[PDB]
Nucleic acid binder design. Structure first.
Lengths: 119, 115, 122, 53, 211
RNA sequence: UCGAUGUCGGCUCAUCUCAUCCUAGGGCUGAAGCAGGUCCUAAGGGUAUGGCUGUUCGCCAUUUAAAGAGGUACGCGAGCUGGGUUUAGAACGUCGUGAGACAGUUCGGUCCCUAUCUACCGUGGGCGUUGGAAAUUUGAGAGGAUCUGCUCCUAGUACGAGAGGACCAGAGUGGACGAACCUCUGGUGUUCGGGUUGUCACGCCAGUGGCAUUGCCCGGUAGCUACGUUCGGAUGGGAUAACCGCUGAAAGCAUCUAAGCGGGAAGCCCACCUCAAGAUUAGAUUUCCCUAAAGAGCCGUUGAAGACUACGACGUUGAUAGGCAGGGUGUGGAAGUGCAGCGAUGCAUGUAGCUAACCUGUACUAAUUGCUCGUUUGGCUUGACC
RNA sequence: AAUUCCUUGUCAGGUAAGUUCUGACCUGCACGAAUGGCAUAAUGAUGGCAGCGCUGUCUCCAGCAGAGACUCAGUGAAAU
RNA sequence: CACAGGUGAUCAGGUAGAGAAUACCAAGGCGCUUGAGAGAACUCUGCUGAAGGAACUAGGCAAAAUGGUACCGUAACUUC
């Protein structure tokens, strides 16, 4: 059974799943527009948006907490430099998913993940 | 607070006021005992080793060493069985649940006072 | 929660030290005995020159369990050992002293001299 | 484990009577006028009057 | 013999002054609007049809919209019918009202609901089949069914054989439950028991048939 | 049946019989009572755990209301096991000159098969049901369930020389079984919080991260769950079984029977719960709609619903999901800074920081009035009515 | 008794209960002295029996993680 | 067979460590030529488990448990 449970498995260990979404969040923060699988796109909203929320107020503790969960000093500086003071007044929903068909290699449902407000 | 609005109403109307106490403290619980027809208050002194805070569903277990063998009792906090609770000694512990004291007996089953 | 082949401390002045449950009485396939339930035991360790010899088969009452006994308010009451008090051939205590506390589920008519001699009755 | 007699061609085709191909739902985008799958961006990137590139 | 439809709101406890905890469950009782009264002359049997809750207009069909309009009641989230008798069809007129007042404290009631669904389940959980040895050379049949029949005689599996399949998600009735408290201004119905289903599910409460 | 039908026992899962072990109803009794003994009726339920042995069995221990006798390829190895029997090694006793042999023993010794059809358990698609649609339903029928202890009282009464000790009535409390549920008591809780060992890295310190079973350890939310909780097995109706009758002749009497009128079982039929119009006899009621309508579906957001389905909710006239806000819960005292200390560390700022799935809200993001299917009053005969 | 059929021999011990085990008896179907007899420290992935510890072996299974199973896309067997 | 097997010798970094064990890394080399979903039964491989603790079973099979260094201490028996 799966009643009221949350989270994805995606055929990975939890250590792999944690590292894969850390990489995706860093990639989405750099390019601001990535193409990925739709199930991965939907779950990326649960790891990437809470980092943007905590960067809305900037402090060493918050800055250090983001780096703990991101481990990318280039994206953590970008998260608190531009992504923070761009979504300050936005109450969530910092990125949008747009379905873009199916993948050629395996017919996986694809979707673009774009940050709102000029990504 | 963790439940549907209308279960919270059935739960707020049943709340007894009680002094605050953390795990690690020594408390005396006055328990309502009925022999055949007469009501008295039996006292259960001991260490609070665990408490779950669930509003009306709150509970706390108290461990005492009654004549050799150790006894634990998980009192239901908001229950008219509990006449009263008073804290004698405030404890200084590093963990919500003091389950490790079940393997401690004498000079090692003791905890520092919070001042 | 006492079942067959489970060792119980002896909580009375009967000479027995440890007894093992060999039957949970009161039902065809009755699995478990809690406090107040009558069991058949074999005494495994006895005190020298006592009232009960090692290897006797007799009746006992469960007086405290490690699983614990529930109360009407929902509280549980757990002990650190599983203890029993040896009984007669008509299921009556043979004790003049009770060691350790017992619970208040022994109130009745047949286990009254167990509650009165108990140091503490929870 | 295995059959005791070969299935007839008729019986084999009755098992194939639920074997259909899924047909995608399509729509015309308001801006570009192009045909695209429902709830999906158009091949050049337009979805619901919005650009992606 | 008529009851009312509610929504399971979750479980809690009610403490008695004597110091007993009563496991209760909260049932929200919205207005039960009477959408049709069926009688022996028009339908062949006597019953009351009620609705409760709400539906937006866009989600109400024209056929249902006219069914409710004839009664004069707002569209509810569903429509339920209670089998009645002549005594039960006394003050029950079309478009009437059925509150939690139908029940009183200390009354035994029958509650019906859809159980939580467990999906496909094996014989061990669905039918309390004994598990087979976890060790002692047991091959890959630890939670297997075991034998399903005899030999050449009868040479089949009998109908009604206990096997894996869908568990839960079925209509289930629990009888002999007491009404702990009734409150009609807030649409309350506190009942002693378990009440099949999850929080949010529709439950039907009727006076107990055992009596 | 030898171009192969696997042997005993165990496990799992059963199904039936009645020559009935318990419970139920009776007649007789060397039936006072309590207990029995026989025989009749009765198959609705129920009908142990162990020690020994490969055992079935049997003996024994302790229970139980009782621990039934049987059929089912001595039920069940394409469901499991492999202890015995019954391969090849080896040995003892015995027989044989011997190679070897032994319903003699002993130590050891590969159990394959992805299920086509029937059957069964679930879950769908199609078409039909005299136009179509949304709902609600009746119930021909089918299944489930059906067990029982003990205590109190009647009453220490009836009965009995005593020992002992009721029927019939009523009150409670269990055991086994089943269902639902998660409030409680717990279990788990690998995207929650901490402690900590080794090593590597983030420039370095500090702080963190990877890996070592989630590294190990201590707790723990939701959900799931039992050993936890709640509920259930009806004391009712009808007709009966054995059995007991009433009146009553054949047969002046007698006689339960031939006419006629009764009582009477856990058994049968209802009653309870679930399913049920493919009940092709395809039922009923309320509405809605017919020059593509009423609706249904696709698609999307999804759900204590779920293998896929189906079912449920929602799609901007919106709280469906995620986020977000505020709470709750859990962990237990963040970081930084300051203070004390030589230091490890302790203290304060501050019950802090973090907090999955929980609660309540909130359009910030994603749910596009897009497409497809589905019409145009529903044949004929008769009767009543008009 | 790695020998004993009758046989679960008898008696003692161990267990609540022991066709196995240990001790003894001798009625050796059918031991017995280099196809060696009786013991024997140490040694053995050797046989039997009995304990402590420990446990999902079990009462009675529950939850969780990963790989399949299930769905989609691609390739595409088998015995019969 | 682009097959989880087998195939002799040589070189032998760091931090821990007795070590060529083991864990994490260096140089160097790889991610093992179907993926994407879902998160049923059931199977496999693991983790945790109330109370009990061999009641399981042919049999503690499997699992659980023990595990290092130093010091103390250690019985029957013995071929010393």
């Amino acid at each position: 059974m799966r009643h009221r449970k949350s989270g994805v498995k995606l055929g990975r260990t939890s250590s792999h799943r944690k590292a894969m979404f850390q990489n995706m969040t860093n990639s989405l923060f750099e390019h601001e527009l990535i193409k990925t699988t739709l199930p991965k796109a939907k779950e990326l909203r649960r790891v990437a948006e809470p980092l943007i929320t905590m960067a809305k107020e900037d402090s060493v503790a918050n800055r250090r907490l983001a780096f703990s969960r991101m481990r990318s000093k280039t994206m953590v500086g970008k998260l608190f430099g531009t992504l923070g003071p761009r979504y300050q007044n936005r109450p969530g929903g910092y990125l949008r998913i747009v379905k873009c068909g199916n993948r050629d290699g395996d017919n996986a449902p694809m979707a673009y993940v774009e940050l709102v407000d000029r990504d | 607070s963790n439940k549907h609005l209308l279960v919270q109403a059935v739960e707020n109307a049943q709340i007894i006021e009680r002094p605050s106490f953390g795990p690690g403290d020594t408390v005396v619980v006055q328990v309502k005992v009925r022999e055949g027809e007469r009501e008295r208050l039996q006292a259960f002194e001991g260490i609070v080793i665990a408490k779950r805070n669930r509003g009306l569903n709150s509970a706390f277990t108290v461990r005492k060493i009654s004549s050799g063998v150790g006894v634990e009792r998980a009192f239901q906090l908001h229950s008219p069985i509990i006449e009263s609770i008073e804290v004698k000694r405030r404890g200084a512990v590093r963990r919500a649940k003091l389950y490790y004291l079940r393997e401690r007996s004498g000079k090692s089953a003791r905890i520092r006072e919070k001042l | 929660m006492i079942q067959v082949e489970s060792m119980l401390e002896v909580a009375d002045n009967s000479g027995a030290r440890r007894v093992q449950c060999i039957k949970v009485l009161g039902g065809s396939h009755r699995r478990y005995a809690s406090v107040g339930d009558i069991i058949k035991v074999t005494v495994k360790e006895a005190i020298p020159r006592g009232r009960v010899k090692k290897g006797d088969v007799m009746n006992a009452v469960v007086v405290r369990t490690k699983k614990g006994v529930r109360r009407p308010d929902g509280s549980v009451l757990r002990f650190d050992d599983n203890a029993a008090v040896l009984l007669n051939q008509n299921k009556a205590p043979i004790a003049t002293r009770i060691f350790g506390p017992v619970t208040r589920e022994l109130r009745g008519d047949q286990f009254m001299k167990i509650v009165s001699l108990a140091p503490e009755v929870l | 484990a295995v059959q005791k007699s070969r299935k007839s061609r008729s019986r084999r085709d009755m098992r194939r009577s639920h074997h259909h191909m899924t047909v995608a739902e399509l729509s015309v985008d308001a801006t570009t006028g192009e045909k695209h799958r429902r709830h999906h961006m158009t091949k050049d990137g337009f979805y619901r009057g919005r650009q992606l590139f | 013999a008529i009851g009312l439809v509610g929504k399971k709101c979750g479980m809690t406890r009610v403490f008695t002054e004597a110091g007993a905890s009563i496991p209760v469950t909260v049932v929200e009782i919205s207005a039960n609007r009477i959408t049709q009264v069926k009688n022996t002359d028009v339908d062949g049997y006597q019953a009351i049809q009620v609705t409760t809750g709400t539906r937006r207009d866009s989600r109400v069909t024209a056929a249902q919209k006219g069914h409710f309009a004839k009664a004069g009641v707002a569209a509810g989230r569903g429509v339920w019918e209670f089998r009645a008798n002549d005594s039960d069809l006394e003050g029950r007129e079309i478009g009437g009202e059925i509150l939690a007042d139908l029940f009183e404290q200390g009354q035994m009631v029958d509650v019906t609901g859809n159980s939580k669904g467990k999906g496909f389940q094996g014989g061990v959980k669905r039918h309390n089949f004994s598990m087979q040895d976890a060790t002692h050379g047991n091959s890959v049949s630890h939670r297997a069914i075991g034998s399903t029949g005899q030999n050449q005689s009868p040479g089949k599996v009998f109908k009604g054989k206990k096997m894996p399949g869908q568990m839960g998600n079925k209509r289930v009735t629990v009888q002999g439950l007491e009404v702990i408290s009734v409150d009609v201004e807030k649409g309350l119905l506190v009942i002693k028991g378990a009440i099949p289903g999850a929080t949010g599910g529709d439950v039907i409460v009727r006076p107990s048939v055992k009596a």
